[PDB]
Design a protein around this ligand. Structure first.
Ligand code: CDL
Ligand code: CDL
Ligand code: CDL
Ligand code: PC1
Ligand code: PC1
Ligand code: PC1
Ligand code: ADP
Ligand code: FES
Lengths: 505, 150, 125, 149, 187, 66, 231, 26, 96
């Protein structure tokens, strides 16, 4: 019963949501530039900053709704396309349906849009995490950094082109564009003075991996003059070229997606970055690397043993889990948790295009939401209690019961209770790893889910419980409606996404 | 009253978490938190063992139903699992993990260290946990999966 | 057993009472930073010992070359250093079982001829 | 606030009782006497009083992780030149103590002759005990073309 | 006494010093303080083991306390720098070690005891605190200005900047009536 | 009905408290009107550049990347 | 629509500004070509009445405004209000309203704060027969009718003076405080002095009337001497 | 019988740090 | 800091002007001047700060209408899948 109307509606929605975002950004930027001689806030109720905040927030939100609709259309379209290809067995019949483009808006960068489930999951993560982070950064943007209210819109446009393109070069360029806005945010919006050095560490560490990926892309392009991302089927790389490409790709994308030993920059940046931008970084900016690694390694044929890469990922997991205990800083502890989860996700991609990719994608989504939740809780603690250190913070539950309850439920979700996409992703990865290498699976599970979990829980429980006798004149009140509903939405997603259609998982 | 291993694992984690809360009822005191954290660590170890056993069962038989597993385990009794450097009997390894988690939750010798410290809870909570609720989880596991351990 | 007098090489804070530190690393903010004013903008005076602990680890550093091996326990340090090698060797030994049996092996399988998961493959007129 | 002993209704203290006196031997062999305050660098005091013989090409160095912080941050870049050297008399030089490694590097790299008592004004932070401190200020070298401007 | 013997990683020597004398450094104590504290500790332990114990014998308790009292009277009479006094101190410290009981009863009136901190008592600062006007009336003028200070609004509890431009009723009349009237009068 | 300038009106008959209260209320109302007018002018300054320069900017971007 | 009207007003204002810019630039270029130095001359740019866009001072022609003074933004003067020499009514952030027969002394400065708490107007409002001495400072204060403020007096935000109150010179009214009617207050922090008498009230009324007459004479003399623009 | 004063704030005694919190005891 | 305007015109702020009264006679030579504004916030009676105080049926109606639309949409979808204009209810339904 599938008809061409659904196909064209899917394509039109995907194409036009990008232009909706772009036109919103363009209008907002034109207003901002041409309303004032100097593009800084006027400290009065009639400033354009209020309009810009409104436009950014409710462009992201409306584009997120349209993205939900377009993602559902894509799911139907992909399912029915697979059915059309698979169903017919007659040799004379073949599915050759050709679509003509609309005459209203042009194709951005003269590229035909191609959408995949992983790309749309990444785009949904971008939308939601960007919404949370923009909601967080309101107190940070003041009177000279208001120009960074558009950072998340720029991120959304970059990610949209990144996930809706079938061109290798455009793919790589979109991946590399993410550096400038993130560096500028960390440099100009971070309150702490150590953020200045943290930004440089972030730039250099990420750029080393960017150069590695650039070398790999140069190898692919120079050898294969193609750029369509599908002509690689008709060209085979020799053993030496293939091993060089996989090594470069893995190391370069692991610089971004933190792997052992390349997580020093991540720890520094998470500790010294804005509490609202740490959410976006951990939640989304480390998963574009995973998506790019998946695309490249599934496109290239590799005839090498992945034991070395699996060992690197497992070593990162073990290192982060063991170090969890020794952190009294909640933000650094959450950063180590992010490193652990990202290393597990990266390990999920070490078997080419096997079924491990499904667990990897689900784990990427759950880690995004869980890291957003954890960093937002740390943000609330730091903002109301003027410290994010375990020695200075104690007995949160008895003065701010809602915040303590949020911490406890965050710990329960992090533990991986059944009924959560966290548990589902752990089940996928461990079920595969048990047959792949059962002893390695046992070691990984033991370390991560006992030693790292206990180290993680020690600090959070100590902060939540106790007796806050110190500085009774300065104790805060409670979570606000904004914070409470953000926490509730994170919990709601982590719980209900387990009912998403199992066809794609 | 769990129909499959997933519900069993859910109930396992839930009793662990709620026992932790009952032990840590006196949240103001950090001395109580130490006993609560001891119980929490042992419960997490038991959860690890139970999760690994369930994963082994799922890998062997593509099913998590309790009745199906009980009526199928005899067929796979003869099987072995190739681990790091040893060929362990499948039934033996699965029963080893189950018995380990059961001992931890039933407070057998060695793993009983948390039970004396769990008495920090109020007497009603202590009675409920120590009579038939927390300390009988291992007994329930053995009774429910008896065909495996036979 | 751990006591400050007899620990020797397992360092820890001394039990003897000490005077508060006169100078210690402190929170510093970017120039012209916008203050955080949540819940009435009430700031309490920070405890010197607590602030010192907050910023001590970040600034801690090794005094002489090779101190890392000796600090703590040499055996545990060597085991931690060799952990990646142990993991790789365990993976290879496990993969021997996969090779001899016929199960999943550590390789980049290429069942799909570059066809991404549930990708839209279409042509235009 | 803080670091003061005033109660409600008290009169302010005189600046005369708070100024710290620095005695200098100029590059031309004459004697000078200037006033400084605690919390500001000797370089700032000397430039405020317009003492000759100091070029200060870098003008105090970096504005973050400065050498003036009592616990010097290890990520500090140190002084960016050696054009503010001053010779301090032994009674106060010993109290100042051993040199930072970056400061010593710059001092030894100085193109003009140096003394064991030499120190950088930007690296010196004024303290109460420095009252009546005697220093000498020979001429410092000129680094680049912009110094003449 | 803080009753923190089994917490804070005390060594056996430190715990023994805490039990025998209230301090962890008995050297700081003088002769009278040492003797009196040791006598009190010995009597407390003897009472714990031979009065509030298992099938306690009160006659034996009386005899034991009498002997201890005579010995401690002799100890107090003895000079501080005497090997006999040192032997007495060692004897009674050994007795304290012998009677040391893990999980010994700790009175609920002492710090670090079971039930010591079960409740958090709220201070008058928290009791007064009421930023909104439901319980404690809130002035429309947020604060009362003090002399020698400007009149500034108090910082709100919630400082979210997600605020729209000022909203006005639909069809709100906002013509500059004052200027219009003055211009009309001027002509 | 008809505009009345309370500040320039005669308030000698009323008590001083009533007089000051009327002046305060009149000032608040006039300030609200002025606030509305200035906000409207700011909104117009926002709208004009958007209408004038949105299409030229889209034209420039479209020509650049297509 | 009001928004469209505002947009049209802004557009025409910008066009006029651009026309002025090009005209003045052309005149300067013509001077350069003609070897004429007239454009170069530096002359005071001070404007007695300066209007912020949409905020134009309004005053009855009967008022005397000193040419040395400066009215800016939303300022509103009454029938015979007198503004002294050198006094500035900035009134740019909010409005400044003055009564029919008030007198503002020389060097008086009036400027209102950005914002205040709820229920407190952020504009300066002055009664009908107020007499403010030279050198006074006022900020977002309400003054009722028949109020005399001594010279060198500071009145801060949210301060309300009722009818007939008198403040001695060289005194400050703390922000957010009330000066009841018919009372004399003095001191740097104002302190109660006494209740005014009928003789003192009559003297103050005569003083303000004399000041109004002196303002009228000043206006006539300045118009005679061409120092006052015949508005 | 006796009218007891309200429960003492002393019941929870504020703890004042007198020793450095060593990073080796984190 | 906050720069919004307190005096809104959408509605009049609830207030009580009798709780605090300003002294206007009997002053001394050492007493400070009284305060001009003495109005306090007055909450509506029966307002409970510990819950949402929500008395509208909009959310419930929206959720119920969404559920009803979902039900009817599923009915139509099942009919379309079975290739019928409407569901063909069977005479007996068993457990499954
Ligand atoms: C303070 C919060 C702090 C949070 C931050 C901290 C977070 C971490 C710590 C957490 C712990 C601390 C916080 C807890 C203490 C809060 C204290 C407090 O605020 O007290 C006031 C608070 C509010 O009460 P109130 O202030 O007195 O009055 C509020 C108004 O009067 C009510 O006005 P009304 O009467 O008009 O009601 C409006 C509306 C309430 O409106 C909403 O909440 C909007 C919801 C929009 C959708 C969002 C996703 C919802 C996902 C499911 C969860 C539903 C919400 C219930 C809460 C979560 C679960 C506990 O009510 C409904 O109609 C309920 C129906 C909702 C169903 C919507 C389903 C959408 C689709 C979901 C996916 C598909 C499902 C398929 C199911 C198939 C059949 C099984 O106290 C409560 O009443 C608590 C209610 C708790 C939930 C139970 C009641 C609802 C049950 C709904 C149906 C499910 C039950 C079984 C149904 C079986 C048949 C299907
Ligand atoms: C390659 C062939 C393998 C197959 C053959 C069979 C296996 C042979 C393995 C070799 C065994 C004999 C050699 C070990 C000597 C001890 C280690 C050493 O030399 O470091 C310097 C040694 C250790 O210095 P340190 O660790 O800085 O001292 C810390 C302080 O004591 C302060 O300590 P604390 O109070 O703070 O407490 C911390 C304590 C306790 O720490 C803890 O509680 C945390 C856990 C620590 C690890 C405990 C072992 C866990 C299992 C390890 C499995 C490794 C698997 C990966 C490697 C596989 C290699 C095939 O940390 C220690 O364990 C330190 C003691 C020394 C390490 C003992 C554990 C590791 C030994 C190597 C095991 C290798 C097994 C291979 C087979 C595995 C199955 C296939 O320094 C001393 O000599 C001081 C005395 C230390 C106690 C010695 C006790 C007697 C040991 C035997 C003496 C006679 C040896 C004759 C050799 C003849 C030629 C071959
Ligand atoms: C282990 C972790 C556990 C964590 C959780 C622990 C437990 C936490 C408990 C505490 C927190 C949750 C429970 C309490 C939540 C608050 C409930 C409440 O009452 O708050 C009051 C709260 C505050 O009250 P307020 O300040 O007055 O604000 C009012 C609202 O702004 C707006 O109020 P309003 O009265 O203005 O109503 C507005 C309404 C307006 O409502 C209406 O308009 C309905 C009535 C008109 C129907 C149409 C008639 C058309 C013809 C005209 C007929 C004549 C006129 C009829 C109407 C007359 C007037 C009634 O508009 C809408 O709702 C728009 C929705 C539209 C899209 C969805 C529905 C449509 C679907 C498609 C329908 C297709 C078929 C229909 C086609 C129609 C033709 C095209 O208001 C609300 O309830 C608003 C809803 C959202 C509240 C927050 C929900 C949070 C949910 C958190 C869930 C967390 C789940 C975690 C699960 C974890 C599992 C592991
Ligand atoms: C060649 C064509 C070029 C087209 C250029 C487009 C020009 C856009 C100019 C924007 C001006 C914004 C201010 C308008 C005046 C607001 C007056 C006011 O507040 O009174 C309340 C009134 C009405 O309020 P109300 O109380 O009736 O609330 C209902 C609101 N509506 C009518 C929308 C359902 O005005 C508004 O509320 C309008 C709000 C406008 C700002 C919206 C911000 C969200 C993001 C969209 C911004 C525009 C970008 C383009 C669209 C998105 C991308 C497709
Ligand atoms: C981890 C190091 C620290 C972090 C920085 C990362 C730097 C290293 C990044 C990975 C580089 C690739 C290493 C694995 C190569 C595997 C293939 C191989 O060489 O085997 C012999 C290969 C494979 O041979 P084969 O035996 O498999 O098959 C071919 C055999 N013949 C030819 C005989 C028929 O043989 C070769 O052809 C030699 C190729 C050597 C290439 C080495 C230089 C690569 C230069 C490009 C990358 C430079 C990145 C620098 C980044 C900045 C560093 C500061
Ligand atoms: C607490 C319990 C702990 C349990 C033990 C945990 C692990 C202990 C260490 C296991 C070591 C296993 C070594 C053999 C596997 C070699 C894999 C390989 O091919 O690598 C070649 C590698 C290179 O591999 P490669 O990847 O280049 O191979 C080419 C790719 N394939 C194979 C796919 C074609 O070469 C090496 O560098 C190996 C160096 C070995 C150095 C000596 C190691 C001695 C270890 C002795 C351990 C003690 C005895 C056993 C104890 C247990 C008995 C039950
Ligand atoms: N930061 C700390 N580092 C090392 N030991 C500590 C520390 N804090 C407490 N201790 C231990 O606590 C005990 C003292 O407890 P405390 O609460 O300070 O009461 P008091 O000092 O009056 O005896 C000592 O054994 C001491 O060694
Ligand atoms: S100013 Fe350059 S080193 Fe001092």
């Amino acid at each position: 019963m599938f008809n061409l109307n659904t196909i064209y509606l899917s394509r039109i929605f995907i194409e036009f949501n990008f232009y909706f975002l772009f036109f919103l950004f363009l209008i907002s930027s034109i207003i901002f530039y041409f309303s004032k001689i100097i593009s800084i806030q006027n400290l009065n109720q009639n400033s354009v900053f209020n309009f810009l905040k409104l436009a950014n927030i409710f462009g992201i939100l409306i584009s997120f709704f349209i993205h939900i609709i377009s993602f559902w259309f894509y799911c139907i379209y992909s399912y029915n396309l697979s059915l059309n290809i698979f169903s017919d067995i007659n040799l004379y019949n073949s599915n050759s349906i050709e679509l003509l483009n609309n005459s209203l808006l042009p194709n951005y960068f003269k590229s035909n849009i191609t959408i995949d489930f992983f790309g749309l999951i990444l785009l949904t993560l971008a939308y939601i995490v960007g919404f949370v982070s923009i909601l967080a950064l309101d107190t940070r943007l003041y009177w000279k950094n208001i120009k960074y209210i558009f950072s998340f819109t720029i991120f959304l446009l970059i990610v949209y082109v990144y996930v809706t393109v079938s061109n290798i070069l455009l793919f790589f360029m979109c991946y590399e564009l993410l550096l400038i806005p993130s560096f500028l945010i960390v440099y100009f919006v971070s309150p702490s003075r150590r953020a200045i050095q943290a930004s440089l560490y972030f730039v250099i560490w990420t750029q080393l991996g960017s150069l590695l990926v650039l070398i790999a892309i140069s190898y692919i392009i120079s050898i294969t003059n193609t750029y369509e991302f599908n002509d690689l089927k008709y060209f085979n790389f020799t053993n030496s070229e293939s091993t060089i490409i996989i090594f470069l790709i893995f190391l370069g994308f692991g610089f971004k997606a933190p792997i052992w030993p390349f997580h020093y920059w991540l720890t520094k940046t998470h500790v010294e970055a804005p509490s609202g931008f740490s959410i976006y970084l951990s939640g989304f900016l480390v998963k574009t690397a995973l998506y790019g690694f998946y695309k490249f390694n599934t496109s290239i044929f590799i005839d090498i043993d992945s034991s070395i890469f699996i060992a690197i990922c497992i070593m990162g997991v073990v290192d982060s889990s063991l170090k969890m205990w020794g952190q009294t800083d909640l933000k650094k502890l959450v950063a180590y948790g992010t490193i652990q989860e990202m290393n597990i996700i990266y390990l999920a991609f070490c078997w080419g295009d096997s079924c491990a990719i499904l667990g990897g994608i689900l784990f990427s989504a759950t880690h995004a939401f869980l890291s957003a939740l954890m960093f937002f809780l740390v943000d609330c603690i730091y903002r109301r209690y003027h410290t994010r250190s375990l020695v200075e913070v104690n007995g949160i539950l008895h003065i701010t019961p809602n915040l303590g309850l949020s911490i406890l439920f965050m710990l329960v979700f992090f533990s991986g209770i059944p009924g959560t996409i966290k548990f589902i992703s752990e089940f996928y990865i461990f079920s595969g790893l048990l047959e792949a290498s059962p002893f390695i699976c046992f070691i990984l599970m033991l370390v991560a889910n006992v030693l790292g979990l206990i180290g993680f829980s020690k600090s959070w429980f100590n902060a939540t419980f106790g007796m806050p006798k110190k500085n009774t004149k300065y104790l805060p009140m409670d979570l606000s409606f904004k914070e409470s509903y953000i926490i509730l939405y994170c919990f709601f997603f982590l719980f209900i996404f387990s009912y998403f259609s199992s066809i794609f998982f | 009253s769990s129909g499959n291993f997933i519900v069993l694992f859910l109930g396992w984690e839930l009793i662990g978490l709620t026992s932790f809360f009952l032990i840590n009822f006196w949240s103001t005191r950090v001395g109580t938190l130490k006993a609560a954290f001891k119980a929490f660590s042992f419960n997490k170890l038991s959860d690890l063992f139970l999760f690994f056993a369930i994963l082994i069962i799922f890998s062997t038989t593509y099913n998590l139903d309790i009745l199906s597993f009980n009526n199928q385990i005899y067929l796979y009794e003869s099987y072995n699992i190739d681990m790091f450097y040893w060929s362990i009997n499948l039934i033996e390894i699965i029963s080893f993990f189950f018995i380990s988690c059961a001992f931890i939750k039933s407070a057998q010798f060695g793993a009983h260290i948390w039970l004396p410290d769990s008495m920090e809870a109020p007497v009603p909570a202590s009675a409920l946990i120590h009579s038939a609720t927390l300390v009988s989880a291992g007994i329930y596991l053995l009774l429910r999966l008896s065909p495996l351990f036979e | 057993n751990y006591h400050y007098d007899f620990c020797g090489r397992a360092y820890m804070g001394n039990p003897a009472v000490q005077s508060p530190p006169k100078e210690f690393f402190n929170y510093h903010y970017v120039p012209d930073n916008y203050p955080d004013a949540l819940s009435g903008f009430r700031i309490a005076y920070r405890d010197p010992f607590e602030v010192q602990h907050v910023f001590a680890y970040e600034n801690w550093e090794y005094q002489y070359d090779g101190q890392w091996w000796s600090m703590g326990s040499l055996a545990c340090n060597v085991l931690f250093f060799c952990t990646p090698l142990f993991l790789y060797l365990i993976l290879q030994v496990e993969e021997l079982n996969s090779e001899k049996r016929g199960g999943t092996s550590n390789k980049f399988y290429h069942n799909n001829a570059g066809f991404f998961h549930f990708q839209i493959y279409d042509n235009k007129q | 606030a803080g670091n003061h002993h005033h109660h409600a209704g008290d009169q302010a203290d005189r600046v005369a009782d708070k100024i710290i006196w620095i005695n200098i031997q100029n590059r031309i062999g004459q004697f000078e006497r200037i006033s400084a305050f605690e919390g500001e660098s000797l370089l700032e005091a000397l430039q405020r009083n317009k003492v000759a013989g100091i070029v200060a090409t870098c003008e105090g160095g970096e504005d973050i992780n400065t050498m003036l912080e009592k616990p010097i941050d290890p990520v500090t870049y140190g002084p960016f030149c050696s054009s503010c050297q001053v010779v301090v008399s032994n009674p106060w030089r010993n109290k100042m103590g051993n040199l930072h490694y970056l400061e010593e590097r710059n001092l030894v790299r100085s193109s003009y002759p140096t003394t064991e008592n030499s120190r950088l004004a930007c690296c010196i932070l004024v303290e109460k005990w420095m009252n009546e401190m005697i220093i000498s200020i020979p001429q410092n070298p000129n680094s680049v073309y912009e110094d003449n401007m | 006494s803080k009753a923190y013997y089994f917490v804070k990683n005390f060594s056996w020597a430190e715990v023994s010093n805490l039990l025998c004398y209230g301090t962890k450094y008995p050297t700081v104590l003088n002769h009278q303080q040492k003797v009196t504290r040791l006598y009190r500790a010995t009597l407390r332990r003897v009472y714990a083991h031979q009065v509030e114990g298992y099938k306690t014998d009160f006659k034996q308790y009386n005899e034991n306390i009498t002997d201890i009292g005579k010995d401690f009277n002799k100890m107090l009479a003895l000079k501080p720098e005497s090997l006999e006094l040192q032997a007495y101190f060692k004897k009674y410290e050994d007795l304290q070690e012998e009677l040391f009981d893990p999980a010994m009863i700790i009175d609920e009136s002492r710090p670090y005891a079971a039930s010591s901190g079960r409740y958090y008592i709220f201070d008058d600062y928290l009791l007064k605190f009421d930023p909104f006007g439901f319980y404690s009336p809130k002035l429309l003028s947020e604060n009362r200005p003090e002399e020698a200070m400007p009149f500034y609004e108090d910082y709100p509890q919630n400082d979210s900047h997600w605020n729209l431009w000022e909203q006005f009723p639909e069809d709100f009349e906002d013509s500059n009536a004052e200027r219009e009237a003055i211009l009309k009068s001027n002509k | 009905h008809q505009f009345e300038n309370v500040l320039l009106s005669n308030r000698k008959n009323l008590t001083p408290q009533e007089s000051v209260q009327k002046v305060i209320n009149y000032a608040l109302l006039q300030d609200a009107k002025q606030r509305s007018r200035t906000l409207r002018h700011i909104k117009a300054s926002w709208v004009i550049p958007a209408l004038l320069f949105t299409y030229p900017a889209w034209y420039l971007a479209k020509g650049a990347v297509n | 629509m009001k928004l469209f009207q505002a947009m049209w007003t802004r557009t025409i204002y910008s066009i006029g500004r651009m026309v002025r810019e090009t005209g003045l630039a052309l005149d300067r270029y013509g001077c350069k070509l003609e070897q004429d130095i007239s454009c170069y001359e530096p002359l005071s740019r001070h404007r007695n009445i300066l209007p912020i866009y949409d905020l134009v001072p309004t005053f009855y022609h009967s008022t005397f405004i000193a040419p040395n003074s400066s009215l800016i933004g939303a300022v509103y003067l009454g029938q015979n209000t007198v503004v002294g020499y050198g006094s500035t009514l900035r009134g740019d952030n909010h409005a400044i309203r003055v009564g029919h027969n008030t007198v503002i002394g020389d060097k008086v400065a009036i400027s209102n704060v950005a914002t205040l708490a709820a229920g407190i107007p952020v504009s300066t409002n002055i009664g009908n027969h107020v007499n403010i001495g030279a050198g006074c400072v006022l900020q977002s204060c309400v003054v009722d009718d028949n109020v005399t403020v001594g010279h060198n007096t500071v009145i801060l935000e949210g301060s309300v003076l009722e009818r007939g109150s008198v403040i001695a010179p060289n005194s400050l009214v703390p922000a957010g405080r009330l000066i009841p009617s018919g009372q004399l207050w003095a001191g740097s922090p104002v302190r109660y002095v006494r209740d005014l008498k009928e003789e003192e009230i009559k003297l103050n009324l005569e003083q303000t009337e004399q000041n109004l007459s002196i303002g009228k004479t000043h206006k006539s003399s300045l118009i005679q001497q061409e120092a006052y623009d015949r508005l | 019988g006796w009218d007891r004063p309200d429960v003492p704030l002393s019941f929870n005694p504020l703890y004042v740090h007198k020793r450095e919190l060593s990073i080796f005891d984190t | 800091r906050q720069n919004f305007a307190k005096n809104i015109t959408t509605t009049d702020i609830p207030k009580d002007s009798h709780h605090f009264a300003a002294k206007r006679s009997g002053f001394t030579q050492t007493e400070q001047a009284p305060f001009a504004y003495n109005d306090v916030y007055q909450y509506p009676k029966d307002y409970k700060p510990w819950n949402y105080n929500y008395k509208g049926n909009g959310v419930l109606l929206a959720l119920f209408l969404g559920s009803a639309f979902s039900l009817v949409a599923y009915e139509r979808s099942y009919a379309s899948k079975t290739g019928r204009y409407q569901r063909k209810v069977q005479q007996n339904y068993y457990q499954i």
